[PDB]
Amino acid sequence: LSVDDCFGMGRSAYNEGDYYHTVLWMEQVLKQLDAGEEATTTKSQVLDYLSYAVFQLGDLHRALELTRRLLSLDPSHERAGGNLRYFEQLLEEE
């Protein structure tokens, strides 16, 4: 499986509401991107799926860390800014 094929696997998982498997696939993609492998998939795309999926597993702190990374690499990302605000709000409540 190429990086892009792993991405398509994770996207397929996500589209079915299987967030646990989305995380596994997207962590594999992100590992390969961060190791410098070439693909058409971008780190921003992977982080967008990965952050949301992690939050669905119940992990706010990790979802926030991933969203901050996403925003660092993609400041005009529509949803990442709104998500960051939402997650930061949840963090103040705990």
Binding site: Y14, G82, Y86
Partner: peptide, 7 residues
């Protein structure tokens, strides 16, 4: 909740 990717 957060907004995730469309598709």
């Amino acid at each position: 909740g957060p907004a995730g990717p469309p598709g």
